[PDB]
Coordinates of C-alpha atoms and ligand atoms in Angstrom, one line a residue:
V83 CA -213.2 57.6 234.8
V84 CA -216.2 59.8 233.9
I85 CA -217.7 59.1 237.3
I86 CA -214.4 60.1 239.1
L87 CA -214.2 63.5 237.3
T88 CA -218.0 64.1 237.7
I89 CA -217.8 63.6 241.5
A90 CA -214.5 65.3 242.0
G91 CA -215.1 68.5 240.1
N92 CA -218.4 69.2 241.9
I93 CA -216.7 68.2 245.2
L94 CA -214.1 70.9 244.6
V95 CA -216.7 73.5 243.6
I96 CA -218.8 73.0 246.7
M97 CA -215.9 73.3 249.1
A98 CA -214.4 76.3 247.2
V99 CA -217.4 78.4 247.9
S100 CA -217.0 77.6 251.6
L101 CA -213.2 77.6 251.9
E102 CA -212.9 80.9 250.0
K103 CA -215.5 83.4 251.3
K104 CA -214.8 85.9 248.5
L105 CA -217.3 84.0 246.4
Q106 CA -220.2 84.6 248.9
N107 CA -222.1 86.5 246.2
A108 CA -225.7 85.4 245.4
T109 CA -224.7 83.9 242.0
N110 CA -222.1 81.5 243.5
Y111 CA -224.8 80.0 245.7
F112 CA -226.7 79.0 242.6
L113 CA -223.4 77.8 241.2
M114 CA -222.6 75.7 244.3
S115 CA -226.2 74.3 244.1
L116 CA -225.7 73.2 240.5
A117 CA -222.5 71.6 241.7
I118 CA -224.5 69.8 244.4
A119 CA -226.9 68.4 241.9
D120 CA -224.1 67.2 239.7
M121 CA -222.1 65.6 242.5
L122 CA -225.2 63.9 243.9
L123 CA -225.9 62.5 240.4
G124 CA -222.3 61.3 240.1
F125 CA -222.3 59.7 243.5
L126 CA -225.7 58.0 243.6
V127 CA -226.5 57.1 240.0
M128 CA -223.5 56.7 237.7
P129 CA -221.6 53.8 239.3
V130 CA -224.8 51.8 239.2
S131 CA -224.9 52.3 235.4
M132 CA -221.3 51.2 235.1
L133 CA -222.2 48.1 237.1
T134 CA -225.1 47.2 234.8
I135 CA -222.7 47.7 231.9
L136 CA -220.3 45.2 233.4
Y137 CA -223.1 42.7 234.3
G138 CA -224.7 42.8 230.8
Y139 CA -227.5 45.4 231.1
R140 CA -229.7 43.1 233.4
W141 CA -230.7 44.8 236.8
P142 CA -228.8 42.8 239.6
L143 CA -230.0 45.3 242.2
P144 CA -233.3 44.7 244.2
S145 CA -236.4 45.0 242.0
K146 CA -238.2 48.0 243.4
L147 CA -235.0 50.0 243.8
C148 CA -235.0 50.2 240.0
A149 CA -238.0 52.5 240.4
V150 CA -236.2 55.1 242.5
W151 CA -233.0 55.0 240.5
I152 CA -234.8 56.3 237.5
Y153 CA -236.5 58.8 239.7
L154 CA -233.1 60.1 240.9
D155 CA -231.9 60.3 237.3
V156 CA -235.0 62.5 236.6
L157 CA -234.7 64.7 239.7
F158 CA -230.9 65.3 239.7
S159 CA -230.8 65.7 235.9
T160 CA -233.9 67.9 235.7
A161 CA -232.6 70.1 238.5
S162 CA -229.3 70.8 236.6
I163 CA -231.2 71.8 233.5
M164 CA -233.5 74.1 235.5
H165 CA -230.5 75.5 237.3
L166 CA -228.9 76.4 234.0
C167 CA -232.2 77.7 232.6
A168 CA -232.5 80.0 235.6
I169 CA -228.9 81.1 235.2
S170 CA -229.6 82.0 231.6
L171 CA -232.7 84.0 232.5
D172 CA -231.0 85.9 235.3
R173 CA -227.8 86.6 233.4
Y174 CA -229.9 87.9 230.4
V175 CA -231.8 90.2 232.8
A176 CA -228.5 91.4 234.1
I177 CA -227.0 92.1 230.7
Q178 CA -230.1 93.8 229.2
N179 CA -231.0 96.0 232.2
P180 CA -228.0 96.1 234.6
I181 CA -229.1 99.0 236.8
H182 CA -232.7 97.8 237.5
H183 CA -231.4 94.3 238.1
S184 CA -229.2 95.8 240.9
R185 CA -232.3 97.3 242.5
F186 CA -233.8 93.8 242.8
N187 CA -230.4 92.0 243.1
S188 CA -230.9 91.3 246.8
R189 CA -230.3 87.7 247.9
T190 CA -233.8 87.4 249.3
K191 CA -235.2 86.9 245.7
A192 CA -232.2 84.7 244.8
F193 CA -233.2 82.2 247.5
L194 CA -236.7 82.2 246.1
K195 CA -235.3 81.3 242.7
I196 CA -233.5 78.3 244.4
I197 CA -236.7 77.1 246.0
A198 CA -238.5 77.6 242.7
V199 CA -236.0 75.4 240.8
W200 CA -235.8 72.6 243.4
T201 CA -239.7 72.7 243.7
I202 CA -240.2 72.4 240.0
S203 CA -237.8 69.5 239.8
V204 CA -240.0 67.6 242.3
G205 CA -243.2 68.8 240.6
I206 CA -242.0 67.4 237.3
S207 CA -240.7 64.1 238.7
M208 CA -243.7 63.2 240.9
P209 CA -245.1 60.1 239.2
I210 CA -242.0 57.9 238.8
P211 CA -241.4 56.6 242.4
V212 CA -245.0 55.9 243.4
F213 CA -246.1 54.4 240.1
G214 CA -242.9 52.5 239.3
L215 CA -242.8 51.0 242.8
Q216 CA -246.4 50.0 242.5
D217 CA -246.0 48.3 239.1
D218 CA -242.6 46.8 238.3
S219 CA -243.4 46.4 234.5
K220 CA -243.9 50.2 234.2
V221 CA -240.2 50.9 235.1
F222 CA -238.6 47.4 235.1
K223 CA -239.9 46.6 231.6
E224 CA -238.0 44.1 229.4
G225 CA -235.8 42.9 232.3
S226 CA -233.7 46.1 232.1
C227 CA -234.2 49.2 234.2
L228 CA -236.1 51.6 231.8
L229 CA -239.0 54.0 232.0
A230 CA -241.7 52.7 229.7
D231 CA -244.9 54.8 229.8
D232 CA -245.1 56.5 226.4
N233 CA -247.9 59.0 227.2
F234 CA -246.1 60.3 230.3
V235 CA -242.6 60.0 228.9
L236 CA -242.9 61.9 225.7
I237 CA -244.5 65.0 227.5
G238 CA -242.2 64.7 230.5
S239 CA -239.0 64.7 228.4
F240 CA -240.5 67.7 226.6
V241 CA -241.4 69.9 229.7
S242 CA -238.3 68.9 231.6
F243 CA -235.7 69.7 228.9
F244 CA -237.3 71.3 225.8
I245 CA -239.2 74.0 227.7
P246 CA -235.9 75.1 229.4
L247 CA -234.1 74.6 226.1
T248 CA -236.3 77.1 224.3
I249 CA -236.0 79.4 227.3
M250 CA -232.2 79.0 227.0
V251 CA -232.3 79.2 223.2
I252 CA -234.4 82.4 223.3
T253 CA -232.4 84.0 226.2
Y254 CA -228.8 83.0 225.4
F255 CA -229.2 84.3 221.8
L256 CA -230.7 87.5 223.1
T257 CA -227.9 87.9 225.6
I258 CA -225.4 87.8 222.7
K259 CA -227.7 90.3 220.9
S260 CA -227.5 92.7 223.9
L261 CA -223.7 92.5 223.9
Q262 CA -223.8 93.3 220.1
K263 CA -226.4 96.0 220.6
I315 CA -216.2 96.6 222.6
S316 CA -213.4 94.1 223.4
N317 CA -214.9 93.5 226.8
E318 CA -218.3 92.8 225.4
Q319 CA -217.4 90.7 222.4
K320 CA -215.2 88.4 224.5
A321 CA -218.3 87.4 226.5
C322 CA -220.1 86.5 223.3
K323 CA -217.7 83.7 222.3
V324 CA -217.4 82.4 225.9
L325 CA -221.2 82.3 226.1
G326 CA -221.4 80.7 222.7
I327 CA -219.1 77.8 223.5
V328 CA -220.9 77.1 226.8
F329 CA -224.2 77.1 225.0
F330 CA -222.9 74.9 222.2
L331 CA -221.4 72.2 224.4
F332 CA -224.5 71.7 226.7
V333 CA -226.9 71.7 223.7
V334 CA -224.7 69.2 221.8
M335 CA -224.2 67.0 224.9
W336 CA -227.7 67.1 226.3
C337 CA -229.9 67.1 223.2
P338 CA -228.8 63.8 221.5
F339 CA -230.2 61.7 224.3
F340 CA -233.6 63.4 224.2
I341 CA -234.1 63.3 220.5
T342 CA -233.2 59.6 220.4
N343 CA -235.6 58.9 223.2
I344 CA -238.5 60.7 221.5
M345 CA -237.5 59.2 218.2
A346 CA -237.6 55.8 219.9
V347 CA -241.0 56.1 221.4
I348 CA -242.7 57.6 218.3
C349 CA -241.0 55.4 215.7
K350 CA -240.9 52.1 217.5
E351 CA -243.0 50.5 214.8
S352 CA -240.8 51.9 212.0
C353 CA -237.3 51.8 213.5
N354 CA -234.7 49.2 214.4
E355 CA -234.5 48.7 218.2
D356 CA -230.9 47.5 218.6
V357 CA -229.3 50.6 217.0
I358 CA -231.5 52.9 219.1
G359 CA -230.5 51.0 222.2
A360 CA -226.8 51.3 221.5
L361 CA -227.2 55.0 220.7
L362 CA -229.0 55.6 224.0
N363 CA -226.4 53.6 225.9
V364 CA -223.6 55.9 224.7
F365 CA -225.7 59.1 224.8
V366 CA -226.5 58.6 228.5
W367 CA -222.7 58.6 229.1
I368 CA -222.3 61.8 227.1
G369 CA -225.1 63.5 229.1
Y370 CA -223.4 62.4 232.3
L371 CA -220.1 63.9 231.0
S372 CA -222.2 67.2 230.8
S373 CA -222.1 67.1 234.6
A374 CA -218.3 67.0 234.7
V375 CA -218.0 69.7 232.1
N376 CA -219.2 72.7 234.2
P377 CA -216.5 72.7 237.0
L378 CA -213.7 72.8 234.4
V379 CA -215.5 75.7 232.7
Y380 CA -215.5 77.4 236.1
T381 CA -211.8 76.7 236.5
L382 CA -210.9 78.2 233.2
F383 CA -212.5 81.6 233.2
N384 CA -212.4 82.5 236.9
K385 CA -209.3 83.3 238.8
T386 CA -210.3 82.3 242.4
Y387 CA -211.7 78.9 241.5
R388 CA -208.5 78.1 239.7
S389 CA -206.4 79.0 242.7
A390 CA -208.7 77.0 245.0
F391 CA -208.5 73.9 242.9
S392 CA -204.7 74.3 242.4
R393 CA -204.4 74.3 246.2
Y394 CA -206.8 71.5 246.7
Ligands
LIG401 C1 -228.0 66.3 233.7 C2 -227.8 65.2 233.6 C3 -227.7 63.7 233.4 O1 -227.1 63.4 232.1 C4 -227.9 63.5 231.1 C5 -228.0 64.7 230.4 C6 -228.8 64.9 229.3 C7 -229.6 63.8 228.9 C8 -229.6 62.6 229.6 C9 -228.7 62.5 230.7 C10 -228.7 61.2 231.4 N1 -229.6 61.3 232.5 C11 -230.9 60.8 232.1 C12 -231.9 61.5 233.0 C13 -233.3 61.6 232.4 C14 -233.9 62.8 232.3 C15 -235.2 62.9 231.8 O2 -235.8 64.1 231.7 C16 -235.6 65.0 232.7 C17 -235.9 61.7 231.5 N2 -237.3 61.8 231.0 C18 -238.2 62.7 231.4 C19 -237.7 60.8 229.9 C20 -235.3 60.5 231.6 C21 -234.0 60.4 232.1 O3 -233.4 59.2 232.2 C22 -233.9 58.4 233.2

């Protein structure tokens, strides 16, 4: 059911930009690209995880395909985090300095920000396909599909998520501070706050459990950590479905487009 919503919401978002040409602004191209990453993640990755859940957490799929699956789950997931990080940076720049942002608000730089995000997503996720496909034990370890290089993993989870997280946590808070510096401004503070709170609460638990697992493997119980990771990956996947409904709620035209289709 999470997979259905995750696919469907992004599918509606991507068409609504095309079917309704009013949302041809530069921002909604970023928003449709984030929807693309989320829908791709829902289509390619998540039913496989549901299948492993049914089959007992053993990888029925061909052996080397396990290597690319994890790679997809890094690239599509890292892209969404980088999309939201760039959204936070650009929206903070818009709030703090609205006039000067309009001078450089041309779409030509907006496309460079897209190429930057989708380039950094590949740059972060380079090792997993080539290394995992070469050595099964690196990414197929324990008989269940899992990425198992501690040295690479603990830094990779950090740069991919925490570095955007501090950029989000230092920009979002500052965006509220700019609004504070009446009713028009303060209404944005709460709506920004809920969006920040959900994605932090839904993304962060997986990563802290992963880093806690790698560091504390000597001093922790494996089974509880495994169950927690099994559920927290689902919650992180729900993070993908979350954003289209947020789009539906605050914007008039997306709501009309989804009501029609
Ligand atoms: C958005 C979204 C997807 O949902 C989410 C959302 C948040 C957390 C987890 C999930 C579940 N996806 C897991 C993806 C993933 C990302 C990684 O960092 C970028 C890494 N490491 C570098 C260790 C491993 C990994 O799992 C293979």
